[PDB]
Amino acid sequence: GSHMLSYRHSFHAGNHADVLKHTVQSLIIESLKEKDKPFLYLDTHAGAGRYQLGRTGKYLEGIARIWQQDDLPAELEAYINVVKHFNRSGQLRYYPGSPLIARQLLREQDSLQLTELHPSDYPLLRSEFQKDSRARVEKADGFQQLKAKLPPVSRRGLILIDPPYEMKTDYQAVVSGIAEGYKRFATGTYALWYPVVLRQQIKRMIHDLEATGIRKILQIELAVLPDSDRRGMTASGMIVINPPWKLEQQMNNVLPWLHSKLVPAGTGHATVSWIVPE
Template sequence: MNYRHGFHAGNFADILKHVVLMRILAHLGVKDTPYRIVDTHAGAGRYDLGSEEALRTHEWRDGVARLDQSPLAPAVEELLKPWREAVAAARERHGSDAYPGSPWLCRHAMRAEDRLIAAELHPQTYKKLTAALGRDSRCKALAIDGWNALRGNVPPKERRGLILIDPPFEEKDEFATLAAETIAAHRKWPTGIYALWYPVKDRRAAADLLGAIEDAGIGRLLRLEIDVDRPEAAGGLGATGLLVVNPPWRLADEARILLPALSERLAQGPRPRYLCEPIRPDG
């Protein structure tokens, strides 16, 4: 699978990833001590839903546009608030077609003392990333391979923070690489939070990822998935997941409120499904 993000910005997979990202950052922001985020495959940082790429697929219409239609239940909206506020800020600054990528969301959530490392290897995308981050001294964009960025920035000096790993899945062995690199990073920094995004096209590959992480003895995992029941004729991605290592306290409880509402609102077929599975929560 080749996940070129410009074609998919604002789709249902982004909604899951970005809503959970903002919840994690909200939890990190509760303590006074600073934190660091390492976004290993950062992308452009900000996307234009009126661009040729986005208009070719229109995937945002079944993603962010669905959430624009009307509010969800009050308990859900309370948890969505950090994400909604960030999207509104991006639109206010860059126009109604703007959709923020993970680096922009991180920058919006960070406090003065927090820091972001955002890695992007593709030269043109890296230029867009640097423009999206601007001259913010809290943020550093690196034009390097994401796996090298992970190896070189763990553990961070803050000793608190998040590693967001969102690879493009261009290589056949990307799931195996994701598992191996996460396990290696966790050995160096076992107390960090790791959020691993993955597409669910091959359920065996997703299961093998979880199995490898578990077999490495990594405890305290939270597996989150949404399946929007995309019709076969439509092609493309129909399910997505996040595996969170060392999830913040109460993130699972929040996901139990968010995921049913999101899966229902984002459904493309009659049988949407979601999964919220804490694994070894006391490990």
């Protein structure tokens, strides 16, 4: 029944892409918290909120390989402490999605705006925030939120754009969506997650992004395999517009260690570079 929901299972949750994406999300959130003034966290495609972990699930090759390491880099501590918060037993059973990363890291003065259209994931997302007055949860198109909900009343925020890329149109929708939001709120930090399945698609998306005229665009990408035309997702990345001051240095500090744990064979790459500088 709708009154007692079961958490969503996921085969993919906590994989290498989630590790990179939620690491970057947490580092941005922590930087925004360097000023007392409130900020908004806007999650265009928020998912269910958390996922129940288990074909052994990909978490065993991603989050599991890092969360208990004695030499965890300092830059990962905020992210990993959220993971630990949802797994007190010391065994990995739940992976916190981006909405719960934000729920645990945001302060009393901050706000959350979360949208999800998936008919089974949305009721779980609503349930994770039933008793959190800072959050608004809606069953609505995520790209539209970049028009309707920006700029925030607080005039500060992190906007996470992280659609499924089930439809090829997502590669276009993310760019025009960013353009709509940026025009309304040019000082926000926009973080876009993308998968590398065909490099050509990401090459075209980035070309479109440059054509918006938007400056200060950082690219962070972790590949577990070199580019292919037949291996599924070989890599994922975070494109960050208006990245916080220390983000580039943090990712240069942490990507070699992350790649050594996430990619035992040492294949692929892990890079930070500027698509468009200041």
